[PDB]
């Protein structure tokens, strides 16, 4: 099964240039003694490929960006025993991609005339034309539309016959002008009904497998299927049909599929994905662990831990990542109940804002905000810039079921990068949590307890066979958390106290008992 194929190793996560300018910089760091056998997985963000906008997620092609990465870096990571996780950004390609450039060059004669989505074609007979030339969907359709920005998800482009056409653009765009020249970049949505797109998916899977990929992340997968009259967020059954088709291709290359979906807990999308034998991200744990630590109570976190076991959910969990801390994910959806009460989520957002966080909301086409979505902040800052809270969150993360993803910047306890978040010309508030580190930063960090203590726990989690065995929550009062893994005679026990923020890790292996602890 695919869930069972998810490797249970600790997974590093970073941009190829997060450490000393390029992926060779991360390799050199990984070759240090402190990092020996720390990670068996590495999710390298998509700027490892040729790309422009959205720091890697506007893909030109899936060859490596030679400024930042090479096949020699991948061989060096394989030498270290590190398997790879990469994106397939299957919902869209850059305007600068060869497919879209061919569309702009040959227009209606292009072999890719059906590869992307002409907006006015898509909505033909389902809306009135705006003065600007684009089709405004009828109110019945526009209401249902899930929107990741104000206005419509369209970019106007220039075809070789001199016409201006509107192409579907759910996410980023850039429009530059001077004298007579209008240039544009953007993430142009792919037509999932096109056999050419599916041929590109298969070739891309083969390319990623050749690079040494073991996991392929289906970026923004819920947005792929589009249909007049639907919301275009996880449309069904269309989204399931696309996923099963990808699954087949994935299996032919020996790859594990991990669809990225920020569904509200109360929709139970994560349960449906798991029941269909797909691993999922754990976007509930980040907020739950903050709430558990901020309140010194395990009640909400334990409930979610119990459902992972009861529902047999294979996850990739995390503290921070390249996006913000998910908060909408904790809600109950349209009718259901969330993992934290609405009021508890909002109060957590307020605290995170007091700690320098910056909220990121969702807005409908009519401009009215729908809800908070994420909170942009480093996890170190989200926890009040306390080494003890970050050590505790890491320890809990490593003992919860699931593959633990480690954000490079949390490993080095980076605080909010306020300067980067406000810099004119930067990517905005997500920069608060994307600081690039030098080799010097790395060195100085390897003398810090907050970095070394995390690495000691990481190396244990990545190597001990205990975590390949049975998981158990040892009953305690609600201010403590005692998590136990046993594989035959090998036992790993986390005994944590949320009130005092103290904890110890006991590891029994080959009759030898060693204790990890960072307070005494």
Residue numbers in the entry: 5 to 524
What do the study's own words say?
Glycoside phosphorylases (GPs) are carbohydrate-active enzymes that catalyze the reversible cleavage of glycosidic bonds using inorganic phosphate. One of the most well-studied GPs in that regard is sucrose phosphorylase (SP; EC 2.4.1.7), which catalyzes the phosphorolysis of sucrose into α-d-glucose 1-phosphate (Glc1P) and d-fructose. Instead, a clear preference for sucrose 6F-phosphate was observed, making it the first sucrose 6F-phosphate phosphorylase (SPP; EC 2.4.1.329) ever reported. Crystal structures of the two SPPs were determined to allow for a comparison of their active site.
In this work, we report the expression and characterization of an SPP from Ilumatobacter coccineus YM16–304 (IcSPP) with active site sequence motifs that are different from the motifs found in TtSPP or in the phosphorylases with other specificities in the GH13_18 subfamily. The enzyme shows high activity on sucrose 6F-phosphate, but unlike TtSPP, it does not catalyze reactions with alternative substrates. The IcSPP crystals contained one protein molecule in the asymmetric unit, whereas the TtSPP crystals contained two. Domain A (residues 1–93, 198–328, and 389–470 in IcSPP) is the largest and forms the (β/α)8-barrel that is characteristic to the GH13 family. In IcSPP, the inner sheet immediately flanking the barrel is considerably larger and formed by three strands instead of two. IcSPP also has an additional set of two strands constituting a third, outermost β-sheet. IcSPP seems to exist as a monomer, whereas TtSPP in the crystal structure forms dimers. In IcSPP, they are found at Asp223, Glu264, and Asp327. In the structure of IcSPP, a phosphate ion is found interacting with Arg152, Glu264, Asp327, Tyr377, and Gln378 in the active site. In IcSPP, the predicted binding partners are Arg152, Glu264, Lys364, Gln378, and Lys434.
